[PDB]
Amino acid sequence: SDLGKKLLEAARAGQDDEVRILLANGADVNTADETGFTPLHLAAWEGHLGIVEVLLKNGADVNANDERGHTPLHLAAYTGHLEIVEVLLKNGAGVNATDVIGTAPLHLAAMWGHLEIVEVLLKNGAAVGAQDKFGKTPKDLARDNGNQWIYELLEKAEKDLRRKLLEAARAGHREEVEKLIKLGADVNTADETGFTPLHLAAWEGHLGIVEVLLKNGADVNANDERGHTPLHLAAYTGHLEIVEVLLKNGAGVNATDVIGTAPLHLAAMWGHLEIVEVLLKNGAAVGAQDKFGKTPKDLARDNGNQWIYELLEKAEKDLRRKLLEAARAGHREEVEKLIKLGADVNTADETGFTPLHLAAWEGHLGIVEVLLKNGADVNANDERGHTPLHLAAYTGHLEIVEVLLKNGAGVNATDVIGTAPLHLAAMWGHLEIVEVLLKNGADVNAQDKFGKTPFDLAIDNGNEDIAEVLQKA
After folding, report:
1. 258 and 349, same structural domain?
2. Considering only CA atoms, which of 211, 268, 213, 204 is closest in space to residue 239?
3. Are residues 9 and 145 in the same domain?
4. Cβ atoms within 10 Å, residue 366
5. Angle at 206 (CA atoms; ends 200, 211), nearest 5 degrees
6. Last residue of some domain: 153, 187, 221?
7. How far, in Å, CA of 289 to CA of 284, rounded?
8. Rounded Cα–Cα distance for residues 77 and 85 (Å)
9. What is the DSSP code string of 366-414?
10. CA–CA separation, 191 and 295 (whole Å)
11. Residue 189, SS3?
12. Residue 60 maps to which CATH number?
C-alpha cells in the first residue's frame, strides 16, 4: 500500500512524528519490505531507539523475520546498539534466533567485539555452543577475528555449564538440567573419575533426567576410569525403569568393568529379581565369570537370593537344550547366538552326545567351525565310547573330517566294541576318507570284538578300491 511504504521510510529516516501519525490514521505496524524488513528492522538497523519503542507500543512483532531469517535482534546486535538490544529482549525477542546461515545474535556480537552485548545476550539466555554452517561457535568467531576478552568470557561460560550440569544431574533438578542443556551444556562432559551426568543420574535414581540426557544425545555406554557404565550403576542401585530405558536406548547388557563384573553380577549379587529378568530378556550372559571365578548364579547362591538362583539355573538349563537342538537342525546364526549367551559347549544329552557329535553326524560343516572356535572337546566319548570322528566317518562328509583332524582328532580311539573310524569308512565306501585317515597314522592291526580288523571288514563288504589300499600299509 502507498501508506505502508511511508511508514518504512519514516522509520529508516528517524522522523518520530511522521511514524506516530501513520499509526493513528490506520497503518499496519507490521508492514513488510520486498526483502522482508519491517519498520522495526529498519529502526533497529539505523539506531532509532525512540521509534523502536513506539513500534512496540502499537504491537510491532518483535520476532518478525525477513525472507532470510534475520530479526531486529540480529540487526541490533550486528550494528552494536546496546540500548535497542535491551529493549527488544525486554519485549520478548528470541535470544537464540538463527538465520539461514545458522548465525545468531551471539555470533554477531562476539564476532564484532560488542562486549556489553555479549554480556546482555548471555544474561538473557543466549546459548554459547551454537554452531553455524561452518561449524563456528561465537567463541570460535571471537578467536578467529581477534576479540580475546570475549573468547575467554565464552570459554568460562562453557566451562561453568559443565560443573552445573553434573551437579544438577546428581542433585536431581530436572528443570535445571533441561535449562542448562538449552543454554549449551555438554551432556557428555565427565568428572575426574569419568562419571558423566548420565552416570550420576543413573546412580542417584533420577529417571526423568536419564531420559532427557539420552534424548539430547548422551553416550549411553560411557566408561569411567574403572570401566563402569550407567547400566552398571542402575543394576547396582536397583532402579528397574532406568535399566529398561538404558537398554531401550542401546546400553551394553554384557559390559564388564576391570574386575570382570557385569550388570548381571550386580543385580544377582544385590537381589534385584526384576532387573535380572530384564537383563536376561535383553541378552545377558549367564556364564560370565568375574576375577574371582564367580558367576551371577554363584553370587546369588553365596548371598542367599534363592529366587534369582532358581531363575538363573533354569536359564542355563534352557541354554543346553537350545544348543543341542540348534546343532541337530543346523542353524549357524542360532548356534553363534546361543554360545554368546554362555551355553556350555561341553554339555551332553542323556546318551552322552555333545553338540559337536550332533554337528558331525548331521553334516553341518558351518556349525562345526564355530563349536571348535569356542573350545569344544575333541575326544568326547558317548556312553558307548563314540567320538565325533566316528560320526563323520560313518556319514562320508569330506570337509568335516578334514576340519576335525586339524584340531587333533583321536585316530586310534575306539568305542566299546573296539571299532575305530577306519573300520567305518572302509565299510560304507568312503575311499577319500580312508586315505585321510592313514595320513595321520591310523592303525590297521587293531581288531574288533569279533576279531575282525579294518582289512577283514573291507573284504567282507566288497569295496574294490579300498580293499587294495588297506593291504598296502
Report:
1. no
2. 204
3. yes
4. 13
5. 95
6. 153
7. 13
8. 7
9. HHHHHHHHT---SS---TT---HHHHHHHHT-HHHHHHHHHT---SS--
10. 31
11. coil
12. 1.25.40.20
Q: Kindly give, in sequence order, each residue whose CB lies less than 8 Å from that of residue 406, ignoring residues fewer than 6 positions away.
A: none
Q: Are 28 and 59 in contact (CB under 8 A)?
A: no
Residue 149 and residue 94 share a domain: yes
Q: Give the DSSP letter string of 16-62.
A: HHHHHHHHHTT--TT---TTS--HHHHHHHHT-HHHHHHHHHTT--T
**64 with 38: CB under 8 angstroms?**
yes
Question: Do 106 and 170 sit in the same domain of this protein?
Answer: no
Q: How far is CA 471 from CA 5, 127, 411, in A?
A: 114, 90, 18
Distance between start and end Cα atoms, the chain:
112
**Whether residues 58 and 114 fall in one domain:** yes
C-alpha cell at 348: 551332553
Cα–Cα distance between 277 and 368 in angstroms, integer?
32
φ, ψ (nearest 5 deg) of residue 250: 95, 20
Query: 449: how many CB neighbours lie within 10 A of its CB?
Result: 11
Residues 6 or more apart in contact with residue 395 via CB below 8 angstroms? 360, 361, 363
Q: Which domain holds residue 65?
A: 2-153
Determined by which method? X-ray
Longest CA span, the chain: 127
- In angstroms, this model's resolution equals 2.4
By the 8 A CB rule, do 156 and 180 touch? no
- 121 and 161 co-located in one domain: no
Residue 262's nearest CA partner among 275, 245, 249, 248 is 275
What is the C-alpha to C-alpha distance for residues 177 and 163, in angstroms, rounded to an integer? Answer: 11
Decide which of 269, 287, 312 is a domain's last residue: 312
Same domain, yes or no: 320 and 290:
no
Report yes or no: 187 and 181 within 8 Å, Cβ to Cβ: yes
Question: Closest Cα partner for 314 from 300, 295, 297, 334?
Answer: 297
- From CA 25, how far away is CA 3, in angstroms rounded? 10
> Is the domain of 304 the same as that of 318?
no
Coil vs helix vs strand at 463: coil
Count the domains in the chain.
3
Fill in the amino acid letter for 348: A
71 in Cβ contact with 63 (< 8 Å): yes
